Design an enzyme around this catalytic site. Structure first.
Site, short mmCIF file in Angstrom:
data_model
loop_
_atom_site.label_atom_id
_atom_site.label_comp_id
_atom_site.label_asym_id
_atom_site.label_seq_id
_atom_site.Cartn_x
_atom_site.Cartn_y
_atom_site.Cartn_z
N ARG A 54 -21.07 13.64 -20.80
CA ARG A 54 -21.44 14.00 -22.17
C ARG A 54 -21.80 15.48 -22.29
NH1 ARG A 54 -26.38 11.24 -23.33
NH2 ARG A 54 -25.20 9.39 -22.68
N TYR A 107 -15.69 24.32 -47.79
CA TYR A 107 -14.86 23.15 -47.57
C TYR A 107 -15.54 21.90 -48.13
CZ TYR A 107 -12.05 20.02 -44.60
OH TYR A 107 -11.21 19.05 -44.13
N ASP A 181 -18.37 29.19 -41.47
CA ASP A 181 -17.15 28.48 -41.12
C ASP A 181 -16.04 29.52 -41.06
OD1 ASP A 181 -14.78 27.02 -40.97
OD2 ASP A 181 -15.66 25.33 -42.08
N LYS A 206 -7.27 23.56 -36.19
CA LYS A 206 -6.34 24.38 -36.95
C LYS A 206 -5.62 25.34 -36.00
CE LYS A 206 -7.86 22.12 -40.49
NZ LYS A 206 -8.94 22.46 -41.47
C1 PLP Z 1 -9.96 21.69 -41.60
C2 PLP Z 1 -11.27 22.20 -42.12
C3 PLP Z 1 -12.44 21.78 -41.50
C4 PLP Z 1 -12.55 20.43 -40.84
O1 PLP Z 1 -11.93 20.32 -39.58
P1 PLP Z 1 -11.47 18.86 -39.05
O2 PLP Z 1 -11.12 19.16 -37.62
O3 PLP Z 1 -10.29 18.42 -39.88
O4 PLP Z 1 -12.63 17.91 -39.19
C5 PLP Z 1 -13.57 22.59 -41.49
N1 PLP Z 1 -13.56 23.81 -42.12
C6 PLP Z 1 -12.44 24.23 -42.73
C7 PLP Z 1 -12.50 25.57 -43.41
C8 PLP Z 1 -11.30 23.44 -42.77
O5 PLP Z 1 -10.22 23.89 -43.41
C1 PLP Z 2 -24.20 4.78 -21.26
C2 PLP Z 2 -25.18 4.31 -22.30
C3 PLP Z 2 -25.01 4.75 -23.60
C4 PLP Z 2 -24.39 6.09 -23.93
O1 PLP Z 2 -23.00 6.16 -23.81
P1 PLP Z 2 -22.29 7.59 -23.54
O2 PLP Z 2 -20.84 7.26 -23.74
O3 PLP Z 2 -22.62 8.02 -22.13
O4 PLP Z 2 -22.82 8.58 -24.56
C5 PLP Z 2 -25.44 3.98 -24.68
N1 PLP Z 2 -26.05 2.76 -24.46
C6 PLP Z 2 -26.23 2.32 -23.20
C7 PLP Z 2 -26.91 1.00 -23.04
C8 PLP Z 2 -25.82 3.09 -22.12
O5 PLP Z 2 -26.04 2.62 -20.89
#
Ligand code: PLP
Ligand code: PLP
Ligand code: PLP
Ligand code: PLP
Ligand code: MG
Ligand code: MG
Lengths: 391, 391, 393, 393
Positions: A54, A107, A181, A206
């Protein structure tokens, strides 16, 4: 030079292990050989030591190093998409009673996060015209915590005077968190953190990915704001998969050559549209006369390929279908930043509905274009054929 | 039968297009051939029509259908990891002034989301002992909105009496949102929604992926709660990449055969530890005498391979290193649910610090084991060698 | 001119393969399911004609790439291989039998030569050689049993450009039925339209410019209608295929191929022009540089240049001097392969080249340096080369 | 017994490949960078010995898989191929030259036979055939020019099990230097330890049980020390390799191979036992079923069974009856390949089998049904088969 930096950013032997590109290390579990190794990894869990998936693997660390180098930041947080980066970066810096001051050209999903998520959590949002410049000082409240910029603006492409905005914010509330952004610039055509902005957010979906086939968000923060961004986004579980991180690093390598073509082609199209009798106005940051063009010319090192224009009339529904359904090269889709040229239409009242506390200043149908890598004369012929369908 | 359902879940021709597994459709932009097609996609943007990559592609739709079938839900939201699924699923159902009532054995990042994110947004969190059963009714406040279960509990493995908890909640606050972190059961050994829980959350990172090399969270909701979960998680930008969605569907196919081996092996190890002179107590839901074992036997259809035990003494730091640094088959790492056996240690005060408003009832060092797919006699020999290093 | 840019963006992208996305879906499969016996019969009949039948024949992802390659190179079919060397070896093998003779340019890629001398020879197939500038005089080398004439233009390492029209016309005069093949990797199959010149099969290491990022390996062979069936079926009997994900990444590389190649051309020609004036350089081998071997044919027959070329130093570097030179570059990296975003450098001593020029001697005495010019700023690359020159002056 | 489960979990997972994760890193590469000339020299010398040199030789990901396969099959090296058919064709080709003779079981996989008759024959290599139960009598078929003896146990489709000890001993008596190879796909290379029986090379379509999910294609060939160098270098001259991602997925498949195979064995033997009592079944061909051809050798020489087997119906189904039967299954799918989590069904008419049994006739007259028994509940699969029987009664 930017082209050399793009080719080399994040590529250190500890990540590449002999190949040109970083290895792809897919992991949740990361193994500790000893208790001492586990203690060291824990201390360095946000500092590039393998600890838990993570937090990232070698593949993420390489991308993070690249983004910090290219955007001049202290750290880079990764997210499942751009909308997640915006939502979680704002969330990381607010609490009940705070106020966010956001450009009214943000956005639409960013606005909807503020109005539908933040408001019920006790965080208010106020709005400003993108050309407000130094006059933003009059909108800063005692509880204003975040000032959120987007330059150029979504759809309508207005460019902020970032130096004037930042100076005015710092005069009243030196400690405020200023965010942008910076997707249209791909974080590299406008060096936000060098202007005194604290956090530069991008939909890497993008231009960084560059091929319309991955989704990922990034947020690069200065030293003052990094630890809070990093830890609060982590508490929301925000991360990207290793393979998309690899594909983002890979996209950086061609970003310079791609952006130059998008700039050259899109400016050619914008100049042509600006002379066209069926076009009322062209909204392209690089086109003389466009809103905030002077600040684009002063503050940016290039253009990308996304812009819009307003037709000389409001299309009926029949005309909209005749226009949009019959293009040969432009495709209708959301998103942008890829190799393919795209087209979408919005009526003025659609835009007015996403300009909080403001009205629009046009009455024709607005067309947003993404200019891809096709031959520009072929794209011009496609646009001309569209004009003939609605003349 | 579960094994047949696991092999077939989500595999319809519209997703597989002739192969056994779903296609991998990598996309942000999804193309509309006409304005009418775009209107239809917009109306069905959360209902399995291609609209935009943040909502999903064919690959995500296939996984979502599989999860809804296997967990008996109306919809399945996808997230970058399990911690993101927990944080965002809770967030989706709260606002300033609400109260969350969470088991004190919840996964530590879940607790930290509540105390470090929710609290400053005006959402309070109270705690309950995992064996509280019907007495939870006395803890329900006028503003209690979410009741958050985790059975078995993290690390210490206590099993709730879910029927008693749910009946007591429904008597006082019929409309409350009852959620469970159902990761240990992989969502299939405990059919949460059939017990009247509203949302079953999983770290698909664990047994669904099954190989320690992808991260992903899921949340399957009943019809009452689906629309709010779906739309509010979407406003936070939560999604998973297409490739990880594919790898999660793929993991389902072997989940039955894997879980049976994890159950058989881990129960054998637990029975052996329970007879061992260096072991004070074994915490395994399937072991007679373990906390809540009676509810496991009544309410679950099997066991996975994660459990813990308490040593007959508190190891010194030197003994901890001698024990943990010298295993031949067990590896030290976080996470679990893979093919590899894993080991971690916690001192009692470490656990007490993550049991809010409670103390622990043991004084020896706690060892958490994940029993993988290795030969169990080899694992027993590795554990025996560890015992000899600390005797 | 950017004439091909629209074609590169759109090649192979039909709705049956993309299913609503911009790019083709990735269909990973061995088993491909037949819903009915009737469907299985149709797939069997059309198992080499783009109906889903078995993963070894391809999935939708392969079909999309094959369509794109046939469009871009003007062929009737495109066979796919695990790498460029597999494409060369298996395309030649598909057309030879015991008793046949292969005529190959002596500048052919070394693994291609070694396939001929170490595999073909023991199977009763002999190989002869020709100088890359032989032109029409190749007619004198064609034997009654010559089945394959194998071209590579520009040549590997030394970059000599064939007079393809003269060679093809001579072959068609003497042996009209011969199979003429070319390794067209340097041109990425698009800067030299081999099949329009009367060549039968254009082979590429898609590993290089088509992938474009140094992270996939794949070979392609695009054949005219006359030769497609034999290529397809005989390569398939050798089990030749590529995985679906690498096919996807090859299609994806096509989309930026035009913009990349223009930058590789511009930057590499600038470097070549500077080297050609440098006191420490004896010769520059760049097809786009006037005076280079076969440059007049490049100018006439190609639509552009890529970024791979070589030059000869004013002296042969010793082993010690080679380390001082190569070990201390800041931007160029030492590696095999090319065609990516990164600039690369490799050295070949003149005696090494002579050993891979069968029946020929080299005409230079200095160390040969092969450069791949990537996408870095060209002034930074020139500074890196200048620093290298200072280490060996 | 689960003896191999620990080895399957750990095979090939060394820190130099995993770099802190449980699984090997995925290193995608053609170019592999040499930091110094000294490093390039060392990599060159060791380019076939697990030093990073060039993507065609492999990256860390391939090295990890190769180590795992050598450990599990007890070999000196493991060559990788784009698919099982490429492994068979290229492993045979690596050891033959003009004038040699190949002796192959007549139950060999059809593409393996077609490689011999359509590729080898035109290169001066002849092929002879033997009945799978020939045992020690194979000695009479070995010619002075026999170079390769090619085994496949159980046989394709019809499942006959060789008496490998008797065959090997006879070959070593008459032609000690011959190369004995086996297609060991059905055993996934681990239920029959071919190299411990004196076979020189064990070939697998890793496509099947090693991948285990019907979504990757890859061939492997594990050779003893005597034969490794020739296999490695001659396959490499044909450009044979697999992509890094499929190598990763093959290593990943190893980790669950034991638990999967035990379920395939248990379920398939249950189905075979039920079919053997069914009034509409003439014969069951399952190596683990008593009475099946070569069952006594399976019992003696194998450590378990997989889930692929076949049976013969009491009648030959017409085309119409074949559709009624196959088109209407609920759980079994019609497809080629096998070894996955899904149950599969395919029909072969007796005359179709006879045509792929060179110099032999079949000894049955009903339609042959090949089943792959996957991971579904076995009672559900039996109900699906029972419904199929009712459609043809
Ligand atoms: C595309 C867009 C986003 C969102 O990105 P996603 O990856 O589609 O969630 C954010 N900011 C701007 C300016 C965008 O055009
Ligand atoms: C592993 C764990 C998570 C978190 O999952 P991740 O994919 O590592 O973020 C949530 N709940 C339980 C019970 C876990 O053991
Ligand atoms: C790279 C090279 C090849 C071999 O391609 P691989 O994909 O590396 O096997 C073939 N032809 C030429 C001209 C080459 O430079
Ligand atoms: C499947 C099959 C092969 C061929 O493998 P592919 O990966 O499909 O090329 C080889 N041997 C046997 C026994 C097979 O069943
Ligand atoms: Mg408005
Ligand atoms: Mg406590």
């Amino acid at each position: 030079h930017l082209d050399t930096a793009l080719v080399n950013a994040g590529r250190r032997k500890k990540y590449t292990q002999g190949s040109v590109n970083s290895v792809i290390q897919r992991a949740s579990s990361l193994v500790f050989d000893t208790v001492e190794a586990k203690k060291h990894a824990t201390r360095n869990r946000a500092k590039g030591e393998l600890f838990y998936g993570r937090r990232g693997t070698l593949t993420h660390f390489s991308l993070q190093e690249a983004m910090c180098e290219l955007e001049g930041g202290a750290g880079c947080a990764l997210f499942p998409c751009g909308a997640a980066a915006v939502a979680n970066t704002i969330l990381a810096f607010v609490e009940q009673g705070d106020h966010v001051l956001m450009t009214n050209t943000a956005y639409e999903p960013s606005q909807d996060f503020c109005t539908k998520i933040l408001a019920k959590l006790g965080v208010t949002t106020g709005w400003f015209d993108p050309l407000i410049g130094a006059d933003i000082a009059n909108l800063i409240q005692p509880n204003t915590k975040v000032v959120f910029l987007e330059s150029p603006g979504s759809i309508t492409m207005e460019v902020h005077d970032v130096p004037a905005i930042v100076a005015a914010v710092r005069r009243v509330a030196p400690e405020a968190i200023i965010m942008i952004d910076n997707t249209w610039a791909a974080g590299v055509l406008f060096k936000a953190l060098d202007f005194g902005i604290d956090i530069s957010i991008q939909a890497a979906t993008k231009y960084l990915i560059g091929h319309s086939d991955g989704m990922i968000g990034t947020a690069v923060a200065n030293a003052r704001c990094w630890e809070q961004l990093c830890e609060n986004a982590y508490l929301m579980g925000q991360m990207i998969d290793a393979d998309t991180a690899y594909m983002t690093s890979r996209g950086l390598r061609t970003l310079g050559v791609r952006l130059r073509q998008h700039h050259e082609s899109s400016l050619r199209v914008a100049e042509w549209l600006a002379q066209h009798p069926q076009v009322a106005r062209v909204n392209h940051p690089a086109l003389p006369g466009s809103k905030g063009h002077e600040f684009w010319k002063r503050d940016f090192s290039g253009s990308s390929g996304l812009f819009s224009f307003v037709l000389n009339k409001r299309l009926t529904d029949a005309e909209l279908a005749a226009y949009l359904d019959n293009f040969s090269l432009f495709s209708m889709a959301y998103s942008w930043g890829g190799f393919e040229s795209l087209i979408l239409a919005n009526q003025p009242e659609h835009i007015a509905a996403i300009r909080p506390e403001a009205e629009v200043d046009f009455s024709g149908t607005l067309i947003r274009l993404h200019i891809g890598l096709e031959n520009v004369d072929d794209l011009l012929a496609d646009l001309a054929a569209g004009f003939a369908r609605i003349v």
